[PDB]
Amino acid sequence: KSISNQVWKFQRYQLIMTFHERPVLPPPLIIFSHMTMIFQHLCCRWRGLKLFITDDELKKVHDFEEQCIEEYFREKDDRFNSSNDERIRVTSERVENMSMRLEEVNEREHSMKASLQTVDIRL
């Protein structure tokens, strides 16, 4: 039952394509169609879901898919960069940089304030 609807859409394609492969008369009157299909085939030989696309529209159908391959990979990049898993990742890497780099600020400003006190004596 949980897969029932999705199975239904697949079983549709089997039914649509078979029934669009049939003669127009019934299986009762199929002798009438089988005389006419032989009639049109022999008069030329002895005497649905497939759009044949010309090469200029095949250009725009192709290049349209070059845009759609880019916003696929771009919205994956946006999804990864905004999901919580990589947000706490990018914060944790950044903060561990600021611990060492504010430690650089702390020791250097302590030495520069001591050098400012020594230089203020000669003033």
């Binding site: 845009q67 880019e70 916003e71 771009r74």
Partner: protein, 331 residues
């Protein structure tokens, strides 16, 4: 020689004695190198030609529609560095304005300076928008490879670190190559680009919301030639507005520091004026004799503050200032 080439490599009239010949090299560049492959067309244009034939090429012979905005990308010629996310917000706002307005972007073209920041800006886009470059013929590297009529010529990102020649950025969509006959000398593209922008700006747009097709010129850093093109922009008929991006240095930071404390243009106090003069003389290492000349030039620029628009970062992209100056300079 005076033209800068080798003495045996030969074959304005003042000291160069040039002869005006028909054009010979034009076509399409296949950019191998620099990541993705991009096709960019190129036409060699003499520096003293009429701009209406350039416009005729750009409309009919190049299949480029008339844009709604002209983002000039004038800046410092030498290569510099910026804050990383300042470059990121610059690139994001630039590509956002370019895709909203359908703009043509007149980036310089040779891959040194603010042009390299534009090429990194389009790498953030990475997916229309036209990016016509105005770079001289004599300064570009592998000039012999770009010779050929209607031929898709290969052009690598081959860029020798000791060569004076500079390779073009591989990620412009179009190219104009200003040939004055000399090699390795600047100034061959400036007046042609000004008359191209003027002949574009006299064209009436289809919407005709403002006064024809509007131009918004953007400055990042720059030398004294940046200040002279600011006076060429502001005092022009029509008065094309300017956008300056500070936090970078050189002329743009000086312009923003003047503009923050100018009031009615010339209403600058004595200590701030002396500080601006001494930072011009020492922080950007200009001569002190021409410092007063550049100051009265800055006053001539500063008399028309209604079109000078600044951008202070501190989300809040540069396209805010771009569209604000677009609405200012439209009448």
């Amino acid at each position: 020689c005076c033209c800068g080439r080798l003495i045996g490599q030969h074959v304005w009239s003042i000291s160069k004695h040039t002869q005006l010949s028909p054009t010979d090299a034009f076509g399409t560049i296949e950019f191998q190198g620099g990541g993705h492959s991009n096709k960019a067309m190129y036409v060699r244009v003499s520096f003293d030609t009429k701009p209406d034939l350039l416009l005729h090429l750009m409309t009919k012979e190049w299949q480029l529609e008339l844009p709604k905005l002209l983002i000039s990308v004038h800046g410092g010629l030498q290569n510099f560095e910026l804050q990383p996310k300042l470059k990121q917000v610059f690139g994001k706002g630039l590509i956002k304005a370019a895709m909203t307005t359908g703009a043509w972007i007149f980036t310089g073209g040779v891959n040194t300076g603010v042009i390299r920041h534009v090429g990194d800006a389009l790498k953030d886009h990475a997916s229309k928008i036209c990016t016509i470059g105005i770079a001289p013929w004599g300064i570009v590297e592998n000039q012999e490879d770009l010779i050929g009529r209607d031929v898709v010529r290969p052009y690598q990102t081959m860029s020798n670190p000791m060569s004076k020649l500079t390779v073009l950025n591989s990620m412009h969509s179009h190219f104009i190559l200003a040939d004055n006959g000399t090699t390795g000398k600047y100034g061959a593209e400036v007046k042609l680009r000004r008359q191209l922008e003027k002949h574009i700006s006299l064209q009436k747009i289809n919407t005709r919301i403002g006064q024809g097709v509007p131009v918004v010129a953007l400055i990042v850093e720059g030398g004294p030639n940046v200040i002279s093109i600011v006076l060429e922009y502001l005092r022009d008929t029509p008065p094309v507005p300017v956008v300056v991006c500070d936090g970078s240095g050189r002329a743009s930071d000086i312009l923003a520091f003047g503009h923050k404390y100018s009031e009615e243009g010339g209403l600058i106090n004595e200590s701030l004026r002396d500080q601006l003069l001494v930072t011009i003389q020492k922080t950007f290492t200009y001569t002190r004799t021409q410092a007063q000349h550049l100051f009265i030039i800055l006053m001539e620029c500063m008399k028309k503050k209604e079109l000078i628009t600044v951008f202070r970062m501190g989300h809040q992209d540069i396209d805010l200032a771009i569209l604000t100056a677009l609405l200012k300079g439209a009448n």
